Design a protein around this ligand. Sequence first.
Ligand SMILES: O=c1[nH]c(-c2ccc(NCC3CCNCC3)cc2Cl)nc2c1oc1ccc(Br)cc12
Length: 274
Amino acid sequence: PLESQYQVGPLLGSGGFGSVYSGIRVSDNLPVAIKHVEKDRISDWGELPNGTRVPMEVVLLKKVSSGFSGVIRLLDWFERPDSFVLILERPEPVQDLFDFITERGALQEELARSFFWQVLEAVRHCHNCGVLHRDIKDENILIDLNRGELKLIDFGSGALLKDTVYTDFDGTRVYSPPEWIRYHRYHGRSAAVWSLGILLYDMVCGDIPFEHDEEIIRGQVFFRQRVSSECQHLIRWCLALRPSDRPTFEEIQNHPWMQDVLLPQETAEIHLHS
Ligand SMILES: O=c1[nH]c(-c2ccc(NCC3CCNCC3)cc2Cl)nc2c1oc1ccc(Br)cc12
């Protein structure tokens, strides 16, 4: 029971998500992350197999936990008077994609591809486990710099995956698809693909392509940097205005630009200098 199992360290960051801290498991010194979430700010609750009230975040994390290292692991969690606490694996050394992109600009395509493929594989996993993330974006992807592996994080906005329409969204606006902006309705897989389209553009251009509802609704994509035509094509496809025109994951991964991906480890050697 309790903290004193773990050993709190520097705050890593905070926001509408809550607050996350570096920490060590005192027993075996495992690097972990301690994420605190206030009950008043939680909005989407669910319940466990064993039948108890919890943040959806926790349900979703348990549903997707496993060997698969494309998604952060939930190690344990605790309930408090006015908060919850989640203990998550921490890789060390680690940097999130956003910070990596600020630091290094528009990524080389070889690297964007390794990365993007890894994201794709992580998301497929979530959908295989019945979970839909709803906030795919550079900040919510961690890079394990030794192993050249990407981990997805922050399921605070996600939802059980379903085949019917979604009328709620509390993700990140600029990553949301046109059909949310206009109609306040979307379907899971097609909304995901759109945000992945924003994600790839961000990677290859050093920034997100739309900053305003107007540009989202319009959906014309302008490339501010040299980007190969296959890449441009893949991105424009993911950003088709009509959802059903977007590619499935299978089509994304069978797309020409996605051929001959580097393994994560050879990515690290070549591109993380390690
Ligand atoms: O849920 C999370 N959110 C966040 C998170 C997401 C977005 C942000 N904010 C935006 C970024 C923060 C850093 N880059 C510039 C601005 C901050 C955090 Cl702390 N981090 C983690 C989360 O779970 C983690 C597990 C292990 C580790 Br290491 C980190 C996390």
